[PDB]
Amino acid sequence: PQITLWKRPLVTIRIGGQLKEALLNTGADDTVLEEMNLPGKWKPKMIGGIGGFIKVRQYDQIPIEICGHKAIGTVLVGPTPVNIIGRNLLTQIGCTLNF
Amino acid sequence: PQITLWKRPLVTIRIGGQLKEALLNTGADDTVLEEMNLPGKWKPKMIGGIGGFIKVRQYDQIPIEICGHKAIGTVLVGPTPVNIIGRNLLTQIGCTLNF
């Protein structure tokens, strides 16, 4: 698709069996999901935002489907207000910014 | 141009006569620049995301140039970690997400 930016660029994702809404976010290095119980090994990490830092759980090699596109990547789980798909996964789905 | 997302999507902007680098951020509703002097009236505002909120100065109807494209719109100034071009200006320059 070509997604205009008059509204937030929200898409449906599927992760750990669950459907969720998430924001396609060119301003995020990483993909950050709201608190959820995901199985698997994880490592603690601190990530920065506009207001300061949050602690997240880093899960590697996680299958995730973004607006119909299958991907496998790192997912961070922690207290973000909104699920965000960052550049690590945007690149896997072939996303570009055009103007 | 069509900008891939292997690296942060940083572009040159001109604001208030000065040249700066900024991040094209589809995950931001609005545009916020690092502390600087700008001419004009402003009002205080809170903005936020990961990590909570910061207090900014909101300037309305400010001319800005983004990678060679002129736009006019609301520019926020405050202690953001990086200069951020949000949707309010991305739309002005015809920016879309494509995959």
Binding site: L23, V32, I47, G49, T80 | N25, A28, G49, I84
Partner: peptide, 10 residues
């Protein structure tokens, strides 16, 4: 609501 979801890996 919050509206600026800039995110950085340290």
């Amino acid at each position: 609501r919050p509206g600026n979801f800039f995110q950085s890996r340290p």
